[model samples]
Target chain A: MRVVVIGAGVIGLSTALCIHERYHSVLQPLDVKVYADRFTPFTTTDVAAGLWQPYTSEPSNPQEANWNQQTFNYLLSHIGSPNAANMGLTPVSGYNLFREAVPDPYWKDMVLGFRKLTPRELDMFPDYRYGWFNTSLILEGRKYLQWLTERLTERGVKFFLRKVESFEEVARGGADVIINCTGVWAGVLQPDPLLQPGRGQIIKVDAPWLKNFIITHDLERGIYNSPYIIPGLQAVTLGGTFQVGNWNEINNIQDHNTIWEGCCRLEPTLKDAKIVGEYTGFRPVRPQVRLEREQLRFGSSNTEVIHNYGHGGYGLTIHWGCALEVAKLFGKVLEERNL
Target chain B: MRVVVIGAGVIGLSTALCIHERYHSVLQPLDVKVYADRFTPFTTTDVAAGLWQPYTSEPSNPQEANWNQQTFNYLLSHIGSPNAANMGLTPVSGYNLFREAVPDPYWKDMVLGFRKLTPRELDMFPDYRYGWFNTSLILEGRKYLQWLTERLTERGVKFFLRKVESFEEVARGGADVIINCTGVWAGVLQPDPLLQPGRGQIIKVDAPWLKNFIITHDLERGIYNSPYIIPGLQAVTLGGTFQVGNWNEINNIQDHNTIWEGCCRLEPTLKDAKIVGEYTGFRPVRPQVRLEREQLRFGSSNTEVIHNYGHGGYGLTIHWGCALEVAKLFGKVLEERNL
Candidate 1:
């Protein structure tokens, strides 16, 4: 079976790995080629703040919630494995504070040390009226992307840096199955009006002194800053805005200042934190994320296109779950076609 | 007429000002008391990275659009007045870019200098494919709130630093009408499920050199960051996040890193910009902002509740429009009751 996967983002790469691993024996010889316009530091996956939270681009329905839960469990299972360090997966404790009283987090049953903050803990942040402390998985995007890329290469998956103008471009090239994981670009390739940009920004600072992550609930007092500090393998990741349909890619100085202030307010010690680098990316958003099979005619053959995009800001949060589903869908496609 | 307006954020203060200004003559004497748990620098209005863009939480209905247009024109009228500086009103030029092509801004016919970017100008941000450059009104929330507070004070509007647990409490206390602008707390005081927190985080920094505000279209590359920079009198505001129903109030360090990285990427020169402060506040959000009047019986006396909360992150953007509407509603209530 010949497979072409468009996009080298976390979704595409993970789908490719899942396909190869799930069908290597049954398909006799499975060939997968991953194509993308940009990779590594240039990709959206490279810029994730790396905190495991399902809150960002939360599931639009129950199925998506299931996907997120599955991915959370998958990541949780791999936390202490030998490859965890190289994969940029770490177990970290953090506080997610809220301005108003809230029910326990939805994932309270799944995560470790999930409980309400004590009175003493609540006093730590005087402005916060309610919150929770939990131990969750944090994956540094830069390292994880590289690790996945290297592993896929080692597993005999061919990688190419190319842009597909349309699905026909790949369909006419003798491809039997194509997985469209192009993310935001899917809006153009699939001509999807629902797909839009869910933009986010992050700052990488050299703050080794910061060990835990602190995410503020939208507050009513002091400076309006909800600082999410995730300590990564390379640098601490400070996050940022979630603007829909915004497409600028420049490093904003005012944003930098706000980040610095937010961090300082969260941890006064970070007042002197040194700057390292910055990034901005868009989450591929849609009213409902498209993830299904489509059969199209190109040239003299019928090509199956397995679409898996529009995870929005939670792509990392649900990558594995979506990839696993893609594998199952591909299997179903094969069964229908008797490939 | 006795009026007790609950919540002293931007909405509450602006509504109080509007009521005092509009009815002081007809009502003989309009007694308006602005009640809030926090004021000025501690209020959410103080943390707004105020830029006059209607695209942010714009109304889904045409009537709301009219209100927004009126407010836009009103702010435009105040741009060059002698009191503009003190009122935190200023005219500024900036680009509002998007990942995908969009129709001309809804306010294109109203704002000054609204136009598409030339191909050459598009090079400023490589990842952005579509954008518009326009001159619009920018407000420094801190200054504007103070200006409004002072103006209200001079006009004999009483300011009370009190927290109201319920609307009935105010209605029974000789209040003829009440305007509820308690923001996120409205979810509790009004027992409104629709009113949720639209969490936002911003950083203020001393980067006087940054004159043009650049807002990305909300992109799909690098890290998902849609940074909006507004140059204010005190400090430039960099923002932020729009997490719906996220009520955490702690400063998130990871969010801080992303903001810094995004701002730095926008203008490399800001790599060394001086830090000022940070903030995280909840924009009072709802599926549809509640801006209507409801009558409730407080013992034997009936008190009219004129609601004007749930402006979301665009509270500064639509403050005047909503306040003007509040004044109109109060007048209607008076005419019907033959006050």
Candidate 2:
């Protein structure tokens, strides 16, 4: 089938590769083209901490839980030796701390060395009483996306760097299947009632010594204030603010100080870390993720549409499994039509 | 002094800024402008392996020795903890090996930890070894040149990325001191008889694990058959061929294999290190560097010309000292004319 994946984010890139790998036998020289306004180091996926933690995601969907597990497994499957490290995958132990008591995290069984922190284990921070620590993955989003693009290009997937218009524009370009992975812009692309924009600001710092991820619940801020530190291949990322319905993508000094102060409070060593860069991006927020199929007729041909977005901050957490589902859905569509 | 330094390579850029900093009060809103056909990472300096060791330079001149020392001190004077490392000033220990015993190098006293290899120390390489090891600086030329341009621009030194014609053309365009810093292109501009083009080829590779520089003299090859590996900030450069009078500035597979086998023999780990880029450049060769001052009349005004080129492969090794001399020459011209 002639496929065009519209978006270069983690979802679109992962979905493109998954579909390409699945349908090569049936599609006979599977033609997959990716169209996006921008690529890695520019996409919102580039801004994410890539901590693989569920935040601002669907409340408790089985698919999300499954997808999160799938992503964790997917990341580990090809990880080892030199290639994994070069591909921007690092084994990072994360300390998820909360001021109040809460249920055990969903990823307790999924990650390595998952354990509840002792009363003395929380000695470093006086503000938090409860904590969970696990050795998980730190996916350096920028390099990972670049790696994704390289792999997709190797699979003979053509990529067009442009602002893709309506679904009909892609359909007219002989797309039999159009997977819309446009993260925040899906609000305007498909014009759904959902899809709110959650703005996130991060400070990239030079701290090569940092090997741990620290995330905590902040009760002082009303909602969506989680102080976190994520170390990547190039720089350690201090994040972030998930201000709901906030459309501003520009850097705010107030947001900068807030993130800076909060991160310093969590890890005092970050205070001395040299600043590499600052980034701000809007995460696609929704009550739940939209991963459904639709049928659209453009001109004289029917184009199968798969709307897969709204992972919010958990896009990296759920990308692989959702991509696999998209591939399965495409396979089903192809089998039904016998194409 | 309304000075226009021709070429944006190391000599032109350094001379432009060095003269400006020294004579800014006496001249130019200190309007120091640089006119060049190309800038980094497209210039000949960009193609260089950036190993700071003089090769094929003037035979036994004290000024050359002073220039060498001055450039070494000039590079290290600004070097400190954070700033030095960021400025691409890497501490690289180089191993200069020869098939036969020769006199100790000129830079033996200047560089750190200069020691001759013992019979026991030369166990790794079976190929006849008389070697000298010393710790010196690895100047990442592309980045250093860009930094020079940035500092030059900071003080309102405008750079015009274009080819300049005659000395008279620059003089008519309101240049009081037109410095000829163009490398190989000086043949057409000044019509010099001594300038010979010594073309050098290299392969840029990624080998971060490589900490030592290996330069071994090969047998059967009379001269310029040193298969060397110089680790840079971005890539470890494997080089090179100093083919005199060969003007072809393109990647030759024969040269590539020669460099590859040579480097792999010197350092076997480099064989697996992936190639990042290939570079070739014509190193302006002369019996001795031409550093002469002349008076050229264009229209009503006389423009002072300082012809400084033909350092061959030692441009980076001697750029700063040459720049200082150019500045001194400009200062002397101003004193003589009483301008």
Candidate 3:
């Protein structure tokens, strides 16, 4: 069986890794190629803080939870290994604060310290009315991408550093199934107006002194100058911005100041930390993430195309689970042909 | 002349480099040593964006201009050389925006395009009513420090990575003269209430497309969320913060956001630029920088010590000029002692 993946970001990498791991031996003559213009340090994932949190469909159901669960366990499986340490799979504990009152997150019990912050605990932030403490996983972007690339390379997958101009263009490359994970680029690849950009800016600093994470937000209008301090092994991630429909990639002084003020107020010590790194990226913003498949009539014959893009900012947060879903779809595709 | 210069930042390195170059042949046994706890990548100047703009005393007079003139010329001397390219010496042209109705800067004629912004040019910004355009020099911080260290080492000066505790303590190390180039840390060595820290935070970005700089300010209240987009060779330096008396070394999300917003507004393309770096440092702020000499009567002898520090954010802007002043003092001290 021959498989092709378009894009080398978290979703594409995870999906390809899953396909290779699940069906490598069972599906003989297995060949997979990942076509992407860039990888690792240049990909959007390189700029991600790698925090594991789901921005799922409202009232995220069992399937959504399954995706997150599979991802959480998969991420945890790599923990405590020397290879994992180098891959940026590590533990992070932080406070999540919200201005609005709401039910606890669906995956509250998935992590350590799922306890809610009492009034006393919430007293530090004047605006926040709800809060929780949790120790969860944060996969550093570039490191994990490098890790996945290594595993894929070892599995005899051809990760091509080439652009997938269009599905029709790649369909010409010939494949049993084509995995579309082009993310924001999907708008150009598939012409989906529903997809836009949720621009984010992050400040990376070496603030080892900050042991815990501090994240604050509101449910309705969302918190202006939304700040989340996720301490990773390499650098403390101070973020973020979701200027939906804004595709500006350069650093915004306004956003920088917003994040600075909010985060500094949240953790005054952050004012003392040196700004070691800064990043800006576009999240694949859409009303909903696409994770479906279709049999398409192409140049020579029909090929099954599985679309698993538009995870938005939560691609890393739940890509493993999505990968599992893609595997199921892969089987369904074969069974549909009475294989 | 056995001289010991404390600190390894821009001022210290430049001072030490100057001392060796001036007296190496004329004064035999011209032993010069730089004592600092850190060097190169760890110094305060290492965090600097290294733009050549002096933060001199109010109404900067002829002497102040001379210092800046010397620095400007010195920075210009290395512009086209391959060695200078590695040393972070490069050309930059940008607009300097101001909200207040201020007169043209004293050193307007020093740069390439010292033209004031006309009504049409000033139409872009809502806040900035006055502005100027100039092509000037920006020295990359880490590269410049490393460059200075290599040059000093080649000149037969020992740069010991050791902290100097006090003037009396270093005098015991047997120095004919001591060069105190400790900026913010000088308060520890000498009891001076006049000195304090002008804490700054910077975001380094890689926006090679940005050919012009955008700097906005106000003379009166001073712009909050002060933003300056300086396009250097390695990275575009987007800054900054000047919280006088706020001695936090950590990166502030607030400052980052402020710089982001202001810079993005100043140049919308900045929002598209990726932040490649971030930095925070304490500017050695005082009513005025100290470039004088003193006689320490201790350690069983009297040794002349020259104080040359506290240029705040403008150390690189005027360091070469300050070095010249230090040389004059060195000769004066030798003459007074009938050398």
Q: Give the lDDT of residue A297 in candidate 3.
A: 83
* Native-to-model Cα distance after best TM-score fit, residue A234 in candidate 2, in Å: 12
Scored by lDDT, the top model is 2
A113 in model 1: Cα distance from truth in Å? 57
- List per-model TM-scores for chain B: 0.95, 0.95, 0.94
- Comparing 1 and 2 by lDDT, which wins? 2
> Runs in model 2 with CA error above 4 Å?
A1-339, B56-60, B219-223, B298-300
TM-score of chain A of 2: 0.95
DockQ of candidate 3, scored on C-alphas against the true complex (2 decimals):
0.01
- Give the alpha carbon lDDT tens digit for every residue of B69-118 in model 1: 77777886664244665677755556776777877867776565466875
DockQ of predicted candidate 2: 0.01
